Amino acid sequence: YEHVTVIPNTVGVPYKTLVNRPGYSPMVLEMELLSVTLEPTLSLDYITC
Amino acid sequence: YEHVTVIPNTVGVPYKTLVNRPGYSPMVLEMELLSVTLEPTLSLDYITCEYKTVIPSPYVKCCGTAECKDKSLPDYSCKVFTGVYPFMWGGAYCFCDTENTQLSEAHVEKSESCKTEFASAYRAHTASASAKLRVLYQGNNVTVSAYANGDHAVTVKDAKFIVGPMSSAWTPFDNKIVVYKGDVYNMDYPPFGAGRPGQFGDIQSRTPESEDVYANTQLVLQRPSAGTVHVPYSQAPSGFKYWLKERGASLQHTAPFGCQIATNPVRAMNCAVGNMPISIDIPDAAFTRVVDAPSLTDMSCEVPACTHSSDFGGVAIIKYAASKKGKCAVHSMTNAVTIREAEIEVEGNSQLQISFSTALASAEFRVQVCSTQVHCAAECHPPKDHIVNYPASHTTLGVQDISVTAMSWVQKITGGVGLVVAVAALILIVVLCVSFSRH
Amino acid sequence: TVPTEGLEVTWGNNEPYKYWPQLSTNGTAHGHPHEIILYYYELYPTMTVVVV
Numbered sequence: 395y396e397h398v399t400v401i402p403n404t405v406g407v408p409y410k411t412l413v414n415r416p417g418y419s420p421m422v423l424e425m426e427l428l429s430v431t432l433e434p435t436l437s438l439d440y441i442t443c
Numbered sequence: 444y445e446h447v448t449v450i451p452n453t454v455g456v457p458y459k460t461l462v463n464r465p466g467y468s469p470m471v472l473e474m475e476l477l478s479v480t481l482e483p484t485l486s487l488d489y490i491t492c493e494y495k496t497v498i499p500s501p502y503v504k505c506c507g508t509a510e511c512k513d514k515s516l517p518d519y520s521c522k523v524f525t526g527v528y529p530f531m532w533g534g535a536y537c538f539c540d541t542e543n544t545q546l547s548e549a550h551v552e553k554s555e556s557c558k559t560e561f562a563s564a565y566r567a568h569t570a571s572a573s574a575k576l577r578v579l580y581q582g583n584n585v586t587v588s589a590y591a592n593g594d595h596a597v598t599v600k601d602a603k604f605i606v607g608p609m610s611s612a613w614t615p616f617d618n619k620i621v622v623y624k625g626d627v628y629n630m631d632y633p634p635f636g637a638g639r640p641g642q643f644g645d646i647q648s649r650t651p652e653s654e655d656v657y658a659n660t661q662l663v664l665q666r667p668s669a670g671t672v673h674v675p676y677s678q679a680p681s682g683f684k685y686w687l688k689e690r691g692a693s694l695q696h697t698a699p700f701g702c703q704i705a706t707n708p709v710r711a712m713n714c715a716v717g718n719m720p721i722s723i724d725i726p727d728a729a730f731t732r733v734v735d736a737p738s739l740t741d742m743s744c745e746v747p748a749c750t751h752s753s754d755f756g757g758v759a760i761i762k763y764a765a766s767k768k769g770k771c772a773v774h775s776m777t778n779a780v781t782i783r784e785a786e787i788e789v790e791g792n793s794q795l796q797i798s799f800s801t802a803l804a805s806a807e808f809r810v811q812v813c814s815t816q817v818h819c820a821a822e823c824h825p826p827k828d829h830i831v832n833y834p835a836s837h838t839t840l841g842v843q844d845i846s847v848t849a850m851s852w853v854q855k856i857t858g859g860v861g862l863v864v865a866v867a868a869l870i871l872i873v874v875l876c877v878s879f880s881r882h
Numbered sequence: 883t884v885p886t887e888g889l890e891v892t893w894g895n896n897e898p899y900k901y902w903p904q905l906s907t908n909g910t911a912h913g914h915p916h917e918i919i920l921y922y923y924e925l926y927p928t929m930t931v932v933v934v
């Protein structure tokens with residue numbers, strides 16, 4: 395049912411997880427991170443031309 | 444055979460049971476009650492309908508004074524008021540002013556409201572244990588409805604049955620109960636002829652067509668001032684203008700045991716407490732011999748994963764070897780485990796599964812298959828979910844609840860100090876004998 | 883607050899709702915330490931806590 399995992403922060407490496415509910419046959423799924431883009435919040439102080 | 448059993452009077456739970464016929468496959472059968480409908484004894488006491496004050500057209504005794512004749516009316520009131528003076532467009536309707544007196548009479552009677560608007564004060568005592576039960580006999584859902592008394596066994600399709608009667612004779616009702624057309628109230632009323640003026644049911648009658656009207660309105664006729672050619676009088680309080688406010692919740696919410704309300708007539712609904720005896724005879728045509736049953740060997744059972752949930756969070760795997768093709772009576776012998784499946788078609792060397800649970804973690808248990816004992820272990824788990832919108836079945840247990848390793852832990856702690864008590868015993872005998880070694 | 887019996891709640895004209903708890907589940911382990919108060923907090927907590 396619910397499945398919480400903590401995968402390592404890896405760009406471009408897959409992860410196999412053993413998802414399984416209590417009572418049924420297990421399953422292995424693949425997830426993958428592709429990008430971790432950190433957008434900084436900004437404010438212009440002044441310019442120079 | 445005939446088989447008699449008593450199930451706990453519990454609304455909405457599948458009851459599975461074994462019917463042992465030795466020399467035959469034991470008829471395991473599933474039946475479940477649906478309705479618990481009680482109907483108390485029918486005894487109307489009296490009625491309370493909305494009265495009205497009847498002020499007849501009074502008597503202006505112009506230029507004279509008369510007496511006060513009393514009629515047999517409920518809350519009768521009459522008074523010759525002197526000093527009156529009538530007004531119209533022409534002013535003085537009487538000729539003079541001083542000698543004009545005026546008779547004033549009024550009382551109270553019923554209204555036309557009483558054909559529909561009323562309320563029965565009512566006496567309620569012992570009820571009719573009526574009910575409904577559905578048996579899934581051999582893939583056949585047969586549902587019957589009858590009263591649980593002890594003699595009225597009803598028979599359909601090789602199955603006679605008498606449900607009950609009810610052991611726990613608790614009722615939500617008492618003797619005193621007032622009823623209006625959408626709502627019942629197990630409250631004390633004043634008896635007929637005993638209504639205090641201004642009270643709940645202060646107007647009293649037996650039926651909506653009884654001409655007797657016991658009334659109490661404490662009424663008194665005050666004096667008109669001057670020229671107010673009418674009857675100023677006191678207040679006659681109706682109980683029915685506050686027949687709503689005192690009600691609060693009705694008895695759909697005051698009842699215990701999940702008991703509900705049916706009106707006209709008032710049936711108590713599904714009030715699960717106690718237990719009900721059912722007794723059913725089916726002859727041997729529904730009973731297959733053990734030699735006519737495919738005998739199972741290789742009773743190798745296990746569970747992939749169990750979970751002591753509310754529902755069937757365990758499902759176990761039976762690998763087996765029957766002799767031949769045919770049905771098999773599968774059965775949970777212990778009340779801790781509730782298999783949800785009655786009988787399974789078994790072929791031979793094959794494998795299937797079974798849906799069940801308990802409320803504990805390590806259920807170790809012997810199922811019964813083609814009259815065959817099989818042991819099997821089950822590690823169940825605490826289920827993830829937390830709210831349940833339905834009662835469970837197998838959870839009817841006690842405190843002696845077996846575990847996974849607290850068995851081993853209690854074995855570890857009983858392997859504690861009692862051995863040191865054996866040490867204490869050897870110290871005691873060795874200090875005894877050396878004291879006896881002196882002489 | 884839901885009892886071990888379960889609770890009815892009605893609201894307005896719509897039909898009430900009947901509720902049952904589980905066994906105070908998921909406070910569970912066995913472990914190389916005790917974790918038997920954990921199993922107890924499954925196995926009917928706060929009653930027969932005195933017995934151990």
Ligand SMILES: *[C@@H]1O[C@H](CO)[C@@H](O)[C@H](O)[C@H]1NC(C)=O
Nearest residue numbers: 457475577578579582583584
């Ligand atoms: C019989 O009734 C049960 C509920 O009592 C239901 O789940 C089942 O599907 C029914 N089966 C048949 C064959 O009518």
